[PDB]
Design a protein around this ligand. Structure first.
Ligand SMILES: *SCCNC(=O)c1cc2cc(F)ccc2[nH]1
Ligand SMILES: *SCCNC(=O)c1cc2cc(F)ccc2[nH]1
Lengths: 200, 198
């Protein structure tokens, strides 16, 4: 078929990492408005049919252990997997509370060879990294650099109105448009091999 | 307004850089089959409706001037623009005949403002090598008859280039080369849906 099979017991997991406060040492300030993002997103993704977990002010070691343990779960009865990262960022790196880890190490755990239960299933990453290569099939990255957040608000609004009738590329194209109309722009890196509808 | 407005005199320009033979001083081999690639691409994109021109074994400066002059042209009557790159590739950089040149420098000429006539219109880059940012750019990037990527892109486009949206085409391309076994990507900064008709 031309779209991902969605006939599973569940839609799948949605991990939200909400980093607001950072250790003085990192020279990063409070990320005001992120709670509003985190909350809109969890409500939104809950409503699509995801099982949402929300983590807050995580260390670098937590974000790593967190995701690794998620990648070691049994995803057989799930349609897909989503992870949302709201934090500080610089080229190819995301901030924990105590430092900096490469976005690539975070996503690497969900790789065909190390996460057999999610093979041929979409793995979704929405990164909202304010202050500034995992090349494998069925990955998708929605990265935004624009400083709740415009990107996050737009994602949520389009998703709650069209989440069940549009394909992700359509959703995220529309998102790109309105963070663009508010006037930087978000992007989308797709390695997807089918079309993705969150419905049945 | 959910789709890019295609109502113009022409679809637009489509430059093809087809680098096969490389200057000794780079120790880069003959890219056999890149000619079957470039011919496949020419016929396909011409059939979509692009004004296609093919340039062979371009040097680094040729590639730069090609694209700068290209951006300097008047694009008032065109729906969009498309560049296809067939070469050797490393990290964020293409090869000319006479060495290497960074991808971004090629697209820099087409930015939001340096090419005011292409503003609000899709600039498509199809790269087959073996940042940067901005509204209405799209990259289809691959690593490896001709290459599996090209062969897939041409077949799907020959068949659905007139009824499917750009992202649907490229997703099918992705799936197709994946079936053969690396995987092509799509970087999208598009703000609308893209159809090659109406
Ligand atoms: S929002 C994605 C950020 N930029 C990239 O990751 C990127 C740009 C680009 C351009 C190319 F020609 C090929 C690959 C590529 N990745
Ligand atoms: S074909 C593109 C290869 N990888 C990238 O260019 C890439 C991956 C990635 C992941 C992100 F979270 C953000 C941007 C990004 N570009």
């Amino acid at each position: 078929t031309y779209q991902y099979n969605m006939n599973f017991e569940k839609l799948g997991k949605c991990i939200i990492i909400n980093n607001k406060n950072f250790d003085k040492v990192t020279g990063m300030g409070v990320r005001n408005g992120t709670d509003k993002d985190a909350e809109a997103l969890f409500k939104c993704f809950r409503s699509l049919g995801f099982d949402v977990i929300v983590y807050n002010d995580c260390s670098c070691a937590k974000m790593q252990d967190l995701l690794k343990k998620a990648s070691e779960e049994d995803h057989t009865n799930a349609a897909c997997f989503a992870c949302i990262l709201l934090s500080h960022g610089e080229e190819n790196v995301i901030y924990g509370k105590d430092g900096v880890t490469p976005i690539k190490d975070l996503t690497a755990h969900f790789r065909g060879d190390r996460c057999k239960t999610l093979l041929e299933k979409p793995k979704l990453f929405f990164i909202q990294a304010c202050r500034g290569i995992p090349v494998e099939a069925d990955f998708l990255f929605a990265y935004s650099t624009v400083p709740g957040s415009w990107f996050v608000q737009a994602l949520c609004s389009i998703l709650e109105e069209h989440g069940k009738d549009l394909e992700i590329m359509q959703i995220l194209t529309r998102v790109n448009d309105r963070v663009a109309r508010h006037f930087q722009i978000p992007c989308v890196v797709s390695m997807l091999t089918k079309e993705l509808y969150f419905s049945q």
